[PDB]
Design an enzyme around this catalytic site. Structure first.
Site, PDB file in Angstrom:
ATOM      1  N   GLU A 163     -12.649  -9.912  -4.624  1.00 49.18           N
ATOM      2  CA  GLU A 163     -11.264  -9.579  -4.302  1.00 49.18           C
ATOM      3  C   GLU A 163     -11.074  -8.959  -2.916  1.00 49.18           C
ATOM      4  O   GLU A 163     -10.158  -9.333  -2.173  1.00 49.18           O
ATOM      5  CB  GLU A 163     -10.660  -8.626  -5.346  1.00 49.18           C
ATOM      6  CG  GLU A 163     -10.295  -9.244  -6.724  1.00 49.18           C
ATOM      7  CD  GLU A 163      -9.258 -10.378  -6.669  1.00 49.18           C
ATOM      8  OE1 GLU A 163      -8.572 -10.531  -5.629  1.00 49.18           O
ATOM      9  OE2 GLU A 163      -9.126 -11.129  -7.673  1.00 49.18           O
ATOM     10  N   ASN A 187       1.749 -12.321   0.166  1.00 47.86           N
ATOM     11  CA  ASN A 187       2.011 -13.620  -0.440  1.00 47.86           C
ATOM     12  C   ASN A 187       3.415 -14.046   0.014  1.00 47.86           C
ATOM     13  O   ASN A 187       4.421 -13.626  -0.563  1.00 47.86           O
ATOM     14  CB  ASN A 187       1.938 -13.502  -1.967  1.00 47.86           C
ATOM     15  CG  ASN A 187       0.555 -13.039  -2.452  1.00 47.86           C
ATOM     16  OD1 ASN A 187      -0.436 -13.746  -2.311  1.00 47.86           O
ATOM     17  ND2 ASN A 187       0.491 -11.840  -2.998  1.00 47.86           N
ATOM     18  N   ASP A 228       6.038 -15.684  -2.762  1.00 45.07           N
ATOM     19  CA  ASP A 228       6.884 -14.918  -3.661  1.00 45.07           C
ATOM     20  C   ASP A 228       7.185 -13.497  -3.190  1.00 45.07           C
ATOM     21  O   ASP A 228       7.627 -12.664  -3.962  1.00 45.07           O
ATOM     22  CB  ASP A 228       6.320 -14.944  -5.094  1.00 45.07           C
ATOM     23  CG  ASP A 228       5.205 -13.941  -5.319  1.00 45.07           C
ATOM     24  OD1 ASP A 228       4.438 -13.638  -4.376  1.00 45.07           O
ATOM     25  OD2 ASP A 228       5.100 -13.449  -6.461  1.00 45.07           O
ATOM     26  N   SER A 282       5.307 -10.905  -2.495  1.00 48.22           N
ATOM     27  CA  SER A 282       4.566  -9.818  -3.111  1.00 48.22           C
ATOM     28  C   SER A 282       3.341  -9.537  -2.255  1.00 48.22           C
ATOM     29  O   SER A 282       2.996 -10.330  -1.374  1.00 48.22           O
ATOM     30  CB  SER A 282       4.141 -10.195  -4.541  1.00 48.22           C
ATOM     31  OG  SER A 282       3.145 -11.209  -4.546  1.00 48.22           O
ATOM     32  N   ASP A 310      -0.863  -7.909  -2.486  1.00 52.26           N
ATOM     33  CA  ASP A 310      -2.021  -7.500  -3.289  1.00 52.26           C
ATOM     34  C   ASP A 310      -2.595  -6.276  -2.572  1.00 52.26           C
ATOM     35  O   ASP A 310      -2.829  -6.317  -1.361  1.00 52.26           O
ATOM     36  CB  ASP A 310      -3.057  -8.624  -3.325  1.00 52.26           C
ATOM     37  CG  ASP A 310      -2.476  -9.927  -3.832  1.00 52.26           C
ATOM     38  OD1 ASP A 310      -1.699  -9.897  -4.801  1.00 52.26           O
ATOM     39  OD2 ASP A 310      -2.791 -10.976  -3.265  1.00 52.26           O
ATOM     40  N   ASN A 349      -1.488  -6.839  -7.572  1.00 49.35           N
ATOM     41  CA  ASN A 349      -0.202  -7.346  -7.111  1.00 49.35           C
ATOM     42  C   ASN A 349       1.041  -6.500  -7.387  1.00 49.35           C
ATOM     43  O   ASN A 349       1.281  -6.047  -8.515  1.00 49.35           O
ATOM     44  CB  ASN A 349      -0.013  -8.763  -7.655  1.00 49.35           C
ATOM     45  CG  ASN A 349       1.144  -9.480  -7.012  1.00 49.35           C
ATOM     46  OD1 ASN A 349       2.256  -9.484  -7.535  1.00 49.35           O
ATOM     47  ND2 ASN A 349       0.889 -10.087  -5.871  1.00 49.35           N
TER      48      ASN A 349
END
Length: 130
Positions: free
Chosen positions: A35, A46, A49, A51, A53, A60
């Site tokens: 990750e 992102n 959408d 968002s 992380d 998220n």
């Protein structure tokens, strides 16, 4: 902070992650490695959408933490996404445990499915004394 392998293993073990909801420490290590490479300040936007992380587990903002700028998002861990960017991973671990209490468990993270599921993850904890 960028964790060294065994340092992270012991840190996660002390925080109670070993076998949490049946998830072994090696699985959590494989997750963090893929990750963020063990980087607590890692972030991924992102554009699709709107968002982001956050942190070592790349949690998220649409569902887990509040950053104030993700449309119609929720905050299931009840944390500011800022808490997921600390050198101390206690809050990130508290939130990761919250994520896995849901039906999917460790499968919540697609990277776990891609790089950890049905793989030899022993390599992540060997020699760490955990």
């Amino acid at each position: 902070k960028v964790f060294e392998r065994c340092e992270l293993a012991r840190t996660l073990k002390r925080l109670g992650m070993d076998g949490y909801r049946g998830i072994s420490l090696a699985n959590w290590m494989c997750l963090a490695k893929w990750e963020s490479g063990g980087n607590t300040r890692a972030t991924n936007y992102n554009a699709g959408d709107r968002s982001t992380d956050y942190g070592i587990f790349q949690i998220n903002s649409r569902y887990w933490c509040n950053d104030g700028k993700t449309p119609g998002a929720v905050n299931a861990c009840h944390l500011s996404c800022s808490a997921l960017l600390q050198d101390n991973i206690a809050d990130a671990v508290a939130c990761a445990k919250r994520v896995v209490r849901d039906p999917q468990g460790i499968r919540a993270w697609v990277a776990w499915r891609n790089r950890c599921q049905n793989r030899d993850v022993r390599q992540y904890v060997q020699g760490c004394g955990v």
